[PDB]
Design a protein around this nucleic acid. Structure first.
Lengths: 317, 317, 316, 314, 317
DNA sequence: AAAAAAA
DNA sequence: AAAAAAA
DNA sequence: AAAAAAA
DNA sequence: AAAAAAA
DNA sequence: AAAAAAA
């Protein structure tokens, strides 16, 4: 009924949070995913210290974390997430020991341990996807101070190293910048800043985002873009009968990933660094378009020239 | 009559300097505040050596400071500040011992000790505010050799770690740069380079700067801006009858909130550095205006396009 | 009937894949050539470890490869390639031993060994040519994430060291970059990025690509150019009667290896990047033309100003 | 009569060169200052090798220097400088021992040693000021092969580490580049590439350069600028009656040091990287020359001082 | 009659080639100089192997060179050069042993060895000057494939390491690139791409190139410029009576070396990255002139805006 | 917009 | 433009 | 355009 | 456009 | 758009 990743995530969240884990609230799912990600990276209190090559300051911080008592049952997480009494058992059972690697487990040959490690990897990937989607959802109506120029915005989201490792194609930030600056191997994944990510309530259920879905404007925009994206993407939504809060999806943007506008010299031609700019691109900027695929077909929509955050702020005035 | 902070500062300065501390001279007040900050930071000769995690060079420097004789009574400070014979008693009484922390004092429960620690913290904050104002006043006519570009000027004033700790929102420099670069938590405070600070002769009295105050051009500018702020802010001053040296404040600037107008490249659209300017192509910056709020109302004044330091230098030729 | 190289490749592919090796599918031929190149480079499981100067990590990887079981008969390769039970015999026989060099064999003087070494070199050259063509065919619709600027795009295709060594005149990548950075000896060869390469279904048969051949648009473009070449090259193709999928070639590009028109700064003058453009100063890059040779004659076609990849994406 | 620094320099030059040291020749004074600087930094032959943390190559070079015989009396220095037989005594006495530090001397408490160290420091400062002046004078007519772009020209003069330490505000080069690139403390000084330096024949006498003094065009330009400075500065010089070789100073440049044209963004304004650019023909600019009558703005010539000096001689 | 350098080169060439060495042919002199350079760098077959720090591949190559038989007397060199039976004696006697350094020879105190090393250095310098001149002469009628852009053309000629070491102010290539990129000591010498090099038939004789000399167009151009220099330089040549092939030099270019067009910011002025480009009015490049000094006087000749190679190619068609 | 590596 | 944390 | 630190 | 260093 | 060397 469900793939391995989604089933593992559902089981883990249900076990850790019991019945307090609502299965239809984006905020609840994002908070639960963040907590599970912290648990599975040994970021919670009372777990193994990360000291393999840590600096003395990092060693002190990890020692303080280890000394600190672990979270207790009944503790409130986020807004409406309450820990059960069994969460310690789950953390002890399903969490790989610090430093564990897939090669070591494979050498061991224990099928149960291999399955547990696969479940842990899938859970990390799912939680990082949910974390990226929540970062986009927050950034629609809350500017990040660190993002002041195009260069600063070029690496959104800014997530920890574990997030980058779990999903290098979606997660940006310092680690993505480091990977791009350094040597690029055959495994290099470029940052698909505007990759389509289903809403968490859809991601856990496995329902792929598509036309006809009943989704709020903010969550749809967080799914297909973020705050500093061109406002024209708002055209991918249409309020339902009686306005309300939930509308419908009318289409999806095209060219979401893989946009390269280079032309190399050949056969006596001249190299071009940008197809769009060549000629007089400054006057053609606001004349650009985006291809939106709808149920009927593809349509080109003129760019609004205004940030998504600014459009949402203005329409909310 | 006066808040706790100003009263504590007045008592401390009176005790240390007696009658030699003028209550109407900005330079004297700034020198006294700097000396008091040094005393409460254990930066004077003969005070506790900082060795908790000091490097061998730092350990040697602190040992040299400790071995050196402490300042004697009657020692000249700055220009017109003379230490009183009772300054040693005040230093011994009102200066918490090195390493003092509010948590430990609260655990002790001594009401007198808690009040003393609160007074010390208030004195630190007041002294740091006076230090920042004096840095602005100095930079109006005497640039800093460490400021060469906009990136360097983004961290003015350049003050020590203690000043940044006391007033993180007003004090820039190396520590502000470090804080901005690293992780930003809920307690992170952005550097307000041009935060309003009344002159020290007003700050100790608590008289908030407002329209109609009889202040000098340079001191007003240091109150609202610094050397590299655009010269248009000079419109906030007006010479009084007969010119002279003291005029009157006609208005104050308004700090605009944070609002980024970027539009990153997405789905084939070209990046926009600024939505407002890209469309019509009005790239000229000299047209920009500042909102000066006056007694009559708010007025948009066109920028001069020249640094405040340059304007002051040219008008003083 | 066929040259030595194509005959060697045909015999090798027939022996290794038997009847499962289709002779008219470009994807199948490309996969077979890739597998043969892997086999003759001792990169498969169970072959000699490359340790002559390997680093400890490289030594570990090669030891892991050697310890691993060799591919078994009937194993599925690519999509429609199945290994025959006699592939092990060919691998043992026709594959030169690791570290073998032509000088050593010539000193030995065994005519059969010399012929085997020559056949192996020809097989490497043919396999690498097919690999380069397949790289071009892939790049027409799926950009390489390692290409983001013109500097990086200058070194396409990005192939391994073996590919560069076998065919230095077609293969780019890190090794070609290193060769360019270092000394340029008399044996140095520049990367002819857009060198015409017949499709594998043509290369193995020896049928040189020319006008009138019934070839698909994508395969023709992969033959004469790659993803980031200008879209104007699409003019070399023309749909046949009834459209369908297979058309015909109407012309081929004329490789413009013209002499440099630079004038370096000297005696206080100013450097000129191009003496021709200096006069009129027509700074419009959309006016350039490419000389396509057709059956009737050569014609100058105006550049489209858009990447071949973008034109293909829009037309699809 | 004279400050400590100039008196110390005059005494040292008299002791080391006797009467052969001409007090009115810029080249001779510069060469004598360079020799004294080499002596007081322990660079001449026969002085202690520098090995504290030297690399094997540096250790070998300094061992070679130590083994090599010390300079002999009567040796020709520069062009018209001859060593005296007593120079060895001065080198042994007034030169601090290698590694001497003012803190150590102060801890010792010997007044004579403290005075000697102060004299050594003043001599180093004076010698490096003269060295920078001479570097400017040379660069007027003989370009440096190391200066090819404005980025390279930004660090003139290129002088040894001892020169940078003696006067970090004037000297440039690799050490100034390192100081600028790295962390800058409260002691940081920016490279004042056109700070006014009196000519050596004036510097040792202590006569501050001012309008009316009889100086040569080349030496005045060296005092106020160098080769790659905009040629308009030549307006500061006026030939005397009958041309000849010596003229007079009419005016001096202003804003020599401390020119910043930034405007940081504030109160919603936009940051301006350059006030001049936001106003843009470069050749229209002017430089403020202060004369006896008053300040006058002279239009920039747009041509490097070296080019103008070369063309005026052809 | 002749300086030490030219006398040494003449003696060495006569000893190694005897009467087969023509004293008026540029190709023959260039070939002889190249062969002597190969001999004096221990690059010929059967000479000392360079193994001090050579890589294993380099060690193999040098071992192969050492094992190979040395050149035999009577071998044909170039076109019209034949080795003499006494060349082995000269190679053994006048060639310093591999690794010989001037410091070691001076320490030994042997006057004869010091003189031999001086002769070796002078011969290296002369051979490298001739090699650079021949490189220019080749580039006039044969483009170098390695030169495709202005940056590539900036380092011509591309000569080996020994050539760069002997004459660093005339020889470019990888080693000049390395010297420019790395630290620049006081001894640093820039690459004078258009220095005046007398033709080999004049360089060995010591006759400095001057006005009125009977030199062919191609060899004059190779003397004063190279393939990708401005075509205007052809004005420095004039066919003699009856045309023929040999003409006469009517003038020489000025500003051959040491051309800097920088003005630095000082006293509030603005930095000029290039005086020519910044010149008042948009100076069209084809309007630029070169100063040719002639017997009568200097004349400004307008640039032809076309390469010397292309001018020669068109004039020969 | 599958899996295997992996401050 | 209040307090509590805290090179 | 004073003193104290100090490849 | 002299001499000494010295992939 | 023939062969020989050969991270």
């Amino acid at each position: 009924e469900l793939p391995r990743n989604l089933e593992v995530f559902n089981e883990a969240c249900g076990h850790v949070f019991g019945s307090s884990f609502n299965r239809e609230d984006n905020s609840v799912i994002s908070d639960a995913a963040a907590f599970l990600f912290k648990m599975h990276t040994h970021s919670l209190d009372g777990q193994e210290a990360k000291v393999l090559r840590a600096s003395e300051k990092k060693r002190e911080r990890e020692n303080a974390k280890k000394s600190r008592k672990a979270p207790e049952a009944g503790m409130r997480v986020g807004r409406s997430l309450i820990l059960t009494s069994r969460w310690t058992e789950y953390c002890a059972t399903c969490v790989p020991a610090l430093g564990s690697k897939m090669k070591v487990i494979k050498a061991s040959g224990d099928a149960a341990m291999i399955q547990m490690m696969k479940d842990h990897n899938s859970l990390l990937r799912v939680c990082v996807r949910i974390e990226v989607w929540k970062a986009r959802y927050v950034s629609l109506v809350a500017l990040d101070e660190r993002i002041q120029t195009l260069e600063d915005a070029q690496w959104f989201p800014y997530l920890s190293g574990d997030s980058y490792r779990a999903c290098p194609g979606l997660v940006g930030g310092y680690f993505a910048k480091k990977a791009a600056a350094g040597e690029r191997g055959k495994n290099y994944k470029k940052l698909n800043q505007t990759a389509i990510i289903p809403p968490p309530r859809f991601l856990i259920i496995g329902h792929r985002l598509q036309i006809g879905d009943q989704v709020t404007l903010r969550e749809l925009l967080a799914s297909i873009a973020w705050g500093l994206c061109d406002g024209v993407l708002a055209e991918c939504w249409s309020p339902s009968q009686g306005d309300g809060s939930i509308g419908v999806v009318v289409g999806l943007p095209l060219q979401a990933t893989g946009s390269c506008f280079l032309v190399v010299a050949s056969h006596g031609l001249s190299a071009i660094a940008d197809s769009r700019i060549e000629g007089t691109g400054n006057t053609n900027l606001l004349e650009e378009c985006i291809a939106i695929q709808k149920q009927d077909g593809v349509i080109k929509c003129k760019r609004s020239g205004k940030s998504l955050y600014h459009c949402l702020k203005e329409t909310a005035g």
